[PDB]
Amino acid sequence: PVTAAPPLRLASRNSVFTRSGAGPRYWNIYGYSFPHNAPIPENEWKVNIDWLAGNFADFGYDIACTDGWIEGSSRTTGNGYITSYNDSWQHDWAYWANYLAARKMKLGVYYNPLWVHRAAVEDASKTVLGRPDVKIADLVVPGDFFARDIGGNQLYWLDVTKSGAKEYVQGYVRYFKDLGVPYLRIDFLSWYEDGRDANIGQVNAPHGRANYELALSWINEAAGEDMEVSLVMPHMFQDGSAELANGDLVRINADADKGGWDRLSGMRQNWQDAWPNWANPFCGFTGWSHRNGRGQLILDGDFMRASTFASDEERKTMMNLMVAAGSPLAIADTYQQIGNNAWVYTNKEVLQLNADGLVGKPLYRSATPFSKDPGSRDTERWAGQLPDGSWGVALFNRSDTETVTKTIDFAKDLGLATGGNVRDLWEHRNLGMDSRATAALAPHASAIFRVTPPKMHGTTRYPAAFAAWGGGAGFNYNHPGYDGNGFVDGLQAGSGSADPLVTFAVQVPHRGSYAIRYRYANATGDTSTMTVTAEKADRSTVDGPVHVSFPGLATWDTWGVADGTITLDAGLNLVTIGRGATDKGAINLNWIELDM
């Protein structure tokens, strides 16, 4: 029988945003500001918003998000917080948040709350929120400008060791949250952390690892559950540990820049040990995929610039990659650039994958980090499972010249026993019951499918190799007999301060008790245990934590099925299985099955 267990120790922010699904749908001003190398004029912001409200907001793109070119945003409140996007603007953030609200839309803000504007420093009357004893001037080291070494002299980096720093940072974050902002986009993280950029050189003073960790913790706490934390230009040191602990989204690619295929798939394929580890999002999504999924990180492939691509097939590939990876769907085409390309963003069936919370993984080929061996994961074949047990499957051809066949086999690759109904979401075509999804793809073309397994008596299988991994859990394939492409290992005593775990999202019809199975290996020589919980998206406990027991078997090549009962509620549950300090032994996990 199961016994009560303490909670697992976590190493991620684990917010409602990352637990509830995929990245958000939004529009960003980058399509204006990047080619203009200029802040967006207020009238251009308005006309874009009005265009969004009449076309894309109805398809869920209901956040209008600002971006950089903010050195000219100098006006601040009495506590040093910027009052608008640019000094040329006639209206403040609240005005625009209300204008958006009237159009069923929300404001997204680009700002880094460790920036302190020189104009606020220079006004002795300005003081830290709740700390009238600390002038804004008292928060900075003389000369410690953002981008100092390439000419920056308008924004300071905050000195987090100064009295008042926490109140300033947290107040800045809450300032936007309170304005009704659901999305805060925080850039130039790596430049704060070590003052280095591998494409430029020394850019400003370093601030160090402990200060970076501290700053991120303050931001996380202040954002809470109401505002999503997007981390842009992070170094992702120590396998992204600080960002995972404190954020919802991490950029995984170099900036979209001029867009097109070279930015989507080119530049360089190799990993490097500094921002951005991978340049193109095919490689970055693939390389950071071990950190994705419910309660871990949402991977951010930056901005979609549809008009910058050479063909409609490339445009579909752009969109299909973002959706496959669970990324934010961030349109950067302006009303002038969009042309005849609105359709790219508004395929209801493709969007439905995002709404349902698809977070795909590339097909794993080995356990070796992708940063060390690009053979270890397949950038061109992606799959993820939805809470109802259906799947999104995406196939890509990154060749510039050849037509190439790509295939995902539901047994051999996904680890299912059932096959599934296959629907091509760009043809809008039912292909019927099949054992595989396949396409002969033209250069730069792709295909994306909804795959729906039939369920005997409600039996739904969730393969662990396509679920969310945390705390050191990961992919392997080094003991035969697993269903699918592999299994999850590393489920033993944690190497540090986190407990290894796997998280599954499951959807059921009513509040109550349901029958669960766990296919596992355990050749430790004794019964092993794992801690199992069920929770709502907001982390509220539905079941457990309980120790579930797993009998010892003869060899690591032997697989068994443990049986259990789990209380699941109607709709979305997160079922997490992991190895805590009070658990015994170790297991390898192949899959769970539910009878809903």
For residues 411 and 365, the answer to whether their CB atoms sit within 8 Å is no
Which position has the token pair 């969009």? 338
231: left (phi over 0), alpha (psi -120 to 50) or beta: beta
Instruction: Give CA–CA dist 580/586, Å, rounded.
Output: 10
544: tokens are 């457990």
For residues 303 and 31, the answer to whether their CB atoms sit within 8 Å is yes
Instruction: Give CA–CA dist 135/282, Å, rounded.
Output: 46
307: tokens are 């008009």
Q: State the helix-helix crossing angle for 312-324 and 281-288, rounded to 10 degrees.
A: 20
Instruction: Give CA–CA dist 146/413, Å, rounded.
Output: 47
Omega of the bond prior to 328 within 30 degrees of 0, cis?
Answer: no
CATH of domain 364-457: 2.60.40.1180
Cβ neighbours of residue 459 under 8 Å, at least 6 residues apart? Answer: 593, 594, 595
The structural domains of the chain, with segments of one domain joined by +, span: 364-457, 459-595
Beta sheet of 420-424, edge-to-edge order: 361-364, 377-385, 391-396, 446-452, 420-424, 429-434
Q: Residue 224: which of 437, 521, 446, 539 has the closest Cα? A: 539
For residues 558 and 481, the answer to whether their CB atoms sit within 8 Å is yes
Q: Which residues pair with 594 in a beta bridge?
A: 460, 516
For residues 280 and 267, the answer to whether their CB atoms sit within 8 Å is yes
Which position has the token pair 């301060």? 497
Provide the CATH topology of domain 459-595.
Answer: Jelly Rolls (2.60.120)
For residues 8 and 531, the answer to whether their CB atoms sit within 8 Å is yes
The sign of the CA dihedral 352, 355, 357, 361 is positive
Strands (E), 129-268: 131-135, 140-145, 155-158, 183-186, 196-197, 201-202, 228-231, 249-251
Instruction: Give CA–CA dist 591/463, Å, rounded.
Output: 4
Q: Residue 286: which of 304, 271, 306 has the closest Cα? A: 271
Cβ neighbours of residue 273 under 8 Å, at least 6 residues apart? Answer: none
Strands (E), 201-241: 201-202, 228-231
Q: In the Cβ-directed half-sphere of 365, how many Cα atoms lie within 13 Å?
A: 15
Q: State the helix-helix crossing angle for 237-246 and 209-223, rounded to 10 degrees.
A: 30
Q: Are strands 571-578 and 501-508 parallel, antiparallel or unpaired?
A: antiparallel
Q: Are strands 420-424 and 25-28 parallel, antiparallel or unpaired?
A: unpaired
- Structure method: X-ray
Instruction: Give yes or no: 378 in active site.
Output: no
* Resolution value, angstrom units: 1.4
**Burial of 335: CB neighbours in 10 Å, binned 0-12, 13-18, 19+:** middle
Q: What is Dmax (Cα atoms) for the chain? A: 74
For residues 397 and 404, the answer to whether their CB atoms sit within 8 Å is yes
Instruction: Give yes or no: 87 in active site.
Output: no
For residues 307 and 339, the answer to whether their CB atoms sit within 8 Å is yes
372 C-beta neighbours (distance < 10 Å), count: 9
Cα three-residue angle 161-166-172, rounded to 5 degrees = 130
**Which one of the listed residues 62, 138, 187, 543 is annotated catalytic?**
187
Instruction: Give CA–CA dist 300/44, Å, rounded.
Output: 26
Three-state DSSP at 343 gives helix
Cα three-residue angle 144-147-149, rounded to 5 degrees = 85
Helical H runs in 40-83?
A: 42-54
224: left (phi over 0), alpha (psi -120 to 50) or beta: left
Instruction: Give CA–CA dist 413/471, Å, rounded.
Output: 25
**Which one of the listed residues 248, 300, 489, 543 is annotated catalytic?**
248
Amino acid symbol at 411:
A
Q: Whole-angstrom distance between the N-terminal and C-terminal Cα of the chain?
A: 22
Q: Residue 178: which of 109, 127, 120 has the closest Cα? A: 109
563: tokens are 């049986």
Amino acid symbol at 373:
D
Instruction: Give CA–CA dist 573/504, Å, rounded.
Output: 8
Instruction: Give CA–CA dist 144/195, Å, rounded.
Output: 11
Cα dihedral 556→560→572→457 (10° resolution): 150
